[model samples]
Target: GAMARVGPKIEITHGGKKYTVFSKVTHLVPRTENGEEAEYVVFGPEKEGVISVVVLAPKDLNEEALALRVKWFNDTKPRCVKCGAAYNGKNHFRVVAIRNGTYYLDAVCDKCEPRITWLSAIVI
Candidate 1:
């Protein structure tokens, strides 16, 4: 396990755009003039030649929820962003960006109260 040298950067060019492949919980949080733009994600099994980066556009959600989806993906740290509680595994609500599939962005209140304080009144 002489794991140190972070070389051989895997750059995949899709839709005539270049993306650097990250094997960790990397961020795609938000914007600027230019920086880490591919804030969305694709979840697949780790394979040879990274043999499953079959990237696809998510099905027709508005960009707001879309942004939060992967924002949740990279925000994984096993703590509810709401009540400030912690849990393990898929015990809390998580928004999985790529459904090719899995979990949430912010750690929700599973152990705290199990539903609605800020989400108090849905108009619809």
Candidate 2:
């Protein structure tokens, strides 16, 4: 379910009509390599209470221009939202949930939990 997002809204004309949009990231694909398949989605706006979205780059493309960080991880010690508590990285799945199509920390802090942040949508 979508929290009725605070608009940072805008009006954009589509095929024939003007549309109101509250931008949202629906999917975040990683830094793809040359000729590698990658895609991203956007929750651009709405029409009659329905969201309009688009997916780009489902096909291979030239190498990504922007230098992106390679995926490397050690131990991400997740902390509590209310009272700073700790949990293991392996247990992050329980602490994590999707905010729409994005991964957000909604986990219990062991002491208490919860974007909690916006970090991982194709880091660059």
Candidate 3:
């Protein structure tokens, strides 16, 4: 079973051009916040590479009931943003990024979060 609801069409403008986005979304999941329901929309825009996201909140909602979705692609995937260290699955390290509440830290192998070698580079 499915239901339809109409609200508003929100558009995001950049540089001076506005993107067309109507709030005619369908929910794969339905979670209630306060007294209203929540919906999850998964869509990929042809104009952008990264996936765009939007969360529709219920009326009179003010308890921070909505949250962003975070996912880890591969637990073993490795990449070095610095030092150009090729991940050989050696060493151990942890990664910390602010999450819902307390500092959410995940212990990842050193090969995962590479060490930053060159902070500043210039040509003389």
Candidate 4:
């Protein structure tokens, strides 16, 4: 039940491990008094992944910031939060469904079975 949305690929290094990530936007929450938001998935080798819920303030969501956001994720250095171990784990993400204008996503830890559910509305 999974289909590639055909999106750009990003190569990044976190902790010291390198990854080639594929991104797909599932929902695009347009601009409002609050801001613009994006719900998307980024997956890579060893199934490293994340369900990103990015919110760009009204003043920050622009053509330039669009590219900046992508660049930020791609270039920023990543640090491990649990063990302080850099690039030592694998992650995976899957789309469960969309209901009531919300996108449901499943985030999994490849090294373990812990699962997390994420609900979002927008593109990031």
Model 3 regions more than 4 Å off = 1-8, 15-18, 25-28, 32-36, 48-124
How far residue 95's Cα lies from its native spot in candidate 2, in Å, is 29
Model 3 scores a TM of: 0.23
| Model 4 segments more than 4 A misplaced | 1-8, 25-35, 42-124
lDDT of each: 0.34, 0.30, 0.28, 0.34
**lDDT ranking from best candidate downward:** 1, 4, 2, 3
Q: TM-score of each candidate?
A: 0.23, 0.23, 0.23, 0.29
Task: Output the worst ten-in-a-row residue range by lDDT, candidate 4.
Answer: 92-101
Summed backbone clashes in each candidate are 6, 6, 0, 6
lDDT score, candidate 4, position 28: 42
Judging by lDDT, tell me the better candidate of 1 and 2.
1
* CA deviation > 4 Å runs, candidate 1: 1-59, 62-68, 76-78, 81-83, 94-107, 116-124
Q: Write the per-residue lDDT of candidate 3 for residues 7-87, one digit (tens) a residue.
A: 323444433333332222233224434433443222222244222223322332222322222122122332333343322
Inter-residue clash pairs, candidate 2: 21-45, 95-107, 105-114, 106-114, 109-112, 109-113
Candidate 4, after superposition: displacement of residue 91 in Å? 4.2
Of candidates 3 and 1, the better by lDDT? 1
- State the lDDT of candidate 4 residue by residue for 1-124, as single tens digits: 8885433244444445444433333344333345434333333334335323232222323334344443444443233233332222344322221222133322233233222222222222
- Which candidate comes out best when scored by TM-score? 4
